[PDB]
Subunit: 486 residues, 3 copies
């Protein structure tokens, strides 16, 4: 008669690494590194992204005619722009503090255009000036949202125009100053020569004089338009005053935020799925602590890491350690045991059998669960934008960001790598111990009444029927008997 102590072993080929070994085969394993996406650009926490198509934020805001096909939502959560957008400043020039503007617009709670200096009211000034650089149908046109004030009659009276912001939200307002190619152009557009463009608020005070000079031709244009912007507060007013060269707004933009997102560079288009974490390659949907999909994410994302696999062993070493039981003094595992991780055999005259030890396999499965769950749910995860915008005179600011983004990459990678490695030698040892303790718990009961074979089995001197066996696995067994002895 006999009773044995053994551990599970299936047909798995899953490999994990531990601090001390590598290519170690285990019965079951969990991967905690997310690497898959749904190849779609999506709504972020339920709200869509502003799709710009081929347009740039500047082109959109200014009303480039080439940007008319734009959807124009009231509320968006990030911005889809392209790398190198085709239609921006149709009329050559520049946009002051442009990055900051995009950062602002990167995520809006409510955003609505409103007419604030209607085109008609500029009597005493020519209002219809366009340019073939903004051509709609071969004919000269102009940024829809703006107005090109030029000489009327042969007289450019001091252009004055203000606007009290009453729409009950902060208002974004953009304006411009035109830089002619030559003093003639300046005159045949404005009459005056010593001109200036003056913009003021409770907070702003900016005066600009135009720069008349020859320049390389852009879209056949040597002249330039320099746009600036401010955020007109609630109940505050904005005062325009100019003797020429002002490109004034027709429209404002009520804007309410909310929070702050970022601009996502991509060729793709919105697609009507959901996500809490969007990449330029697609959307991530995971509970996992780490991923390697793409560094430029937006939303609540896992830690981006430079790894290809991060695998936790969860089951035991598959054997077709610290305590020397598994693949130790117990040479191999039993495919025959299916109920659980560890258990017994017993060879009787009533029949042979396998039977997992419920209590020990339970206490273990629960533990390994806490482990995996711990590695996963202790990870703090907030909402970030990552991808960022910097000008050409900001290569250092940009590089400071990169030094920082890299720093965290290195830190998270080294940790997640070693976390898996260290936690894995522990897990195996854990299983090994459990078995070794299960072995010892029987050896200590049986004591004198069994030969200790050494393969992890015990050969009973006395006969040990089913009931008896069950007492050995019970915790009963005793012992008085004695027998033998004889």
């Amino acid at each position: 008669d006999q009773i044995c102590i053994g551990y599970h072993a299936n047909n798995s080929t899953e490999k994990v690494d531990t601090i001390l070994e590598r290519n170690v085969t285990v019965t079951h394993a969990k991967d905690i590194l997310e690497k898959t996406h749904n190849g779609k650009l999506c709504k972020l926490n339920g709200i869509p992204p502003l799709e710009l198509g081929d347009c740039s934020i500047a082109g959109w805001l200014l009303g480039n005619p080439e940007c008319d096909r734009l959807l124009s939502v009231p509320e968006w959560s990030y911005i889809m722009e392209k790398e190198n957008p085709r239609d921006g400043l149709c009329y050559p020039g520049s946009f002051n503090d442009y990055e900051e503007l995009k950062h602002l617009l990167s995520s809006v709670k409510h955003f609505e255009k409103v007419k604030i200096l209607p085109k008609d009211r500029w009597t005493q000034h020519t209002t219809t000036g366009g340019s073939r650089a903004c051509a709609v149908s071969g004919n000269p046109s102009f940024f829809r949202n703006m107005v090109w004030l030029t000489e009327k009659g042969s007289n450019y009276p001091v252009a004055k125009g203000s606007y009290n912001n009453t729409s009950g939200e902060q208002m974004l307002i953009i304006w411009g100053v035109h830089h002619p190619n030559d003093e003639t152009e300046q005159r045949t557009l404005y009459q005056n020569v010593g001109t200036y463009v003056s913009v003021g608020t409770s907070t702003l005070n900016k005066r600009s004089t135009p720069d008349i000079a020859t320049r390389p031709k852009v879209n056949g244009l040597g002249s330039r338009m320099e746009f600036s912007w401010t955020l007109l507060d609630m109940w505050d007013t904005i005062n325009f005053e100019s003797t020429g060269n002002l490109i004034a707004p027709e429209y404002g933009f009520k804007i309410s935020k909310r929070g702050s997102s970022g601009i996502m560079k991509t060729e793709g288009t919105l697609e009507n799925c959901e996500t809490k974490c969007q990449t330029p390659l697609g959307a991530i949907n995971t509970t996992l602590p780490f991923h390697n999909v793409h560094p430029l994410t937006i939303g609540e994302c896992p830690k981006y890491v430079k790894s290809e696999k991060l695998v936790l062993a969860t089951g035991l070493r598959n054997v077709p350690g610290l305590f020397g039981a598994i693949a130790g003094f117990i040479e191999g595992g039993w495919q025959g045991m299916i109920d659980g991780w560890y258990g017994y055999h017993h060879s009787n005259d009533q029949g042979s059998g396998y039977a997992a030890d419920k209590e020990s396999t339970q206490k273990a499965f629960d533990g390994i669960t806490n482990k995996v769950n711990s590695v996963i749910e202790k990870m703090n995860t907030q909402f970030e934008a990552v991808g960022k915008e910097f000008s050409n005179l900001e290569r250092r600011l940009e590089n400071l960001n990169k030094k920082m983004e890299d720093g965290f990459l290195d830190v998270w990678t080294y940790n997640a790598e070693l976390l898996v490695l260290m936690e894995n030698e522990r897990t195996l040892d854990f299983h090994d111990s459990n078995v070794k303790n299960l072995y010892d718990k029987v050896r200590m009961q049986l004591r004198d009444n069994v030969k200790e074979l050494g393969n992890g089995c015990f050969e009973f001197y006395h006969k040990c029927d089913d009931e008896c066996m069950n007492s050995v696995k019970n915790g009963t067994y005793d012992y008085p008997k004695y027998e033998e002895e004889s």
Copy 2:
């Protein structure tokens, strides 16, 4: 003879990688969460208290900022969120954030008269404004001087100052932007005016901007202040045909190091600290805290946790080695001398208490801690710079939290196992001696 382990009446719970809600005999918390609700001196030196004033209001001499204490040496700055008294006269202050950063912590700071008001003969020196009113009557930033037309003549205003006070000197100046060409004339006569400021390093020329504006404090005009740091033995040259708001005083400034501005409603209180938060002052040897993210001084790592508890004693039983709560079913309340015993085993309880000591001490004293400001200042055209700081401050938050959480968790399954082993080794040390002469129950 018996082999057993200690077990008191504790209810203290810790978590381990493998289990949670585990009860241990004794435990240490390494997360600091308490403050003394006071704003305090930092490393012995006080903070500049601004009260309702803004740094700008203070420096320019807003009349509303006269009640200010004005120490010679401070270690941080107490400002409010939305200070009532700043630029009484509407306008702006160039490179303001940078200035605040500079002034955030001074080793020595002392006002000195450098272009005395009197000496501006040939210029009217007494101009004020009801926007800076003291007692219904028009007044003006005390530290500044409003040069205006005298007689009906504004001669080229010239004034220089050689810095001899043997310290770097902060100097602030201004350019007035009138509401209309009339105001400009009835203040300065001239129309094509400019304000010129120069040093060995500085060269700035400004023309005033005459334009209509929204009224602020009933004022459409504006004042635009700029500043420089005049070096030792260097000179500053003012020159102007109008619209210059020149300084009467400079500020000798020596630093030292660098602190930061702390936003708070509260007032200084005469306690000490090496670590100040807006909620109060922290006093701890602990490696982590969650008091408030905006700290100044030598602080523990700010972490997003509520508890971080190290088990130190053993599992309380009223593991890897299967002794504790294992083949030895329970603990003895009867044993009081130490952790394990038969009468506690002095040598084994000692070697263990020493070990668990090294553990806790190691977790605590390996933490590198330097002096930082955290809270920071950024303008409106700096929302990105600001956001870059937040992405970074968050990044570290996530890193430290994830680590401290798991550190506690991992180090706790180890500690218990440690105890378990010690017992099991104590048991084996006896079983191996006794051998043949005892029944092994």
Copy 3:
């Protein structure tokens, strides 16, 4: 059953103890340099000597002794360079320029507005502030357009960039001390300097005012720069006060490095990691040589030692074998970490257990290797450049650099500590398992002494012994 013990005095620390002596140990903290400034990944650094980037580019006469490579990987500048703007003034967006020039793939000067062609303008103006041999001179690379005859015609000059690479171009605007100087240099008074490209549009008027004298000069020169694109043109136009370029700079990059402040000179050695104290050459994960590095460097940490135990506790734990129920180690055993003794009537002996010492040495190898080769390492510059109106940007960088210092230090410290209590326990276990593997075989036929030895009842000749170490025996 016993374990190895040599004559080592090497000490490591563990979570639970300190000053623990082990048989063998590995240090993973690099602290040594070769005291040389070196080529970085095969390419040399631009050596500036006493010159500043500005002095170099503008052609300060004092900067003629410069080597001038076509391709460099970092820049050697000094803290407080003697020769920069010989003529007092300033340089707009200077930091950014240095950052750009910090590392070039190809860099070559080319004449783009030859001095001669400025007829109708005096081209020979110098200054004793840029004196070569007591005589007035001027930035070699620049040209001081001044009145010719008594007439300063509108100065015009353009240049189409055809050299097939981005071109750096620097220009200047002169700020006279007084309206007289302005006239006796340019005739005109309402002057302006105008510079344009497809992207640039800058107009500057000179500032005439009195100033503290620098190099006996109250006047000032204010230089600005742009990056003229391929096939783009740059248009100068000026009625006075323009200090125009004679030369451009073809520039191609590549990547991005940084400026290294040092007194020393290039030396013809190699490195992938350069510090201001010398060059690092290591596979180690951490170092404490100096924080301002350039290249692929280990993590800079605030430690003095970071030592992994690798061999076992030297005894002249969790499992209670080493320094436990087996009181000491055997100097007699040399073959490996653990093994047996056996006292026979054919002779005594020592003999390490090959299979167990192997499996262990392999493991401890994976450990060290793992700590070392999982460390992600990229190329960075660290040291950085910020102006005086950037004390915040600078401080933001310091808060960040510190942040990582604290993080890496706390981790490497604890990594070593934790991994070391594990390593010792590991050895302890291996022994204890070796002991149990024999006890389980021998069973009934031996008295179990208790010192880690077994006394055979039956006689156990050589063959027999070998069966005990075999795995046979029966």
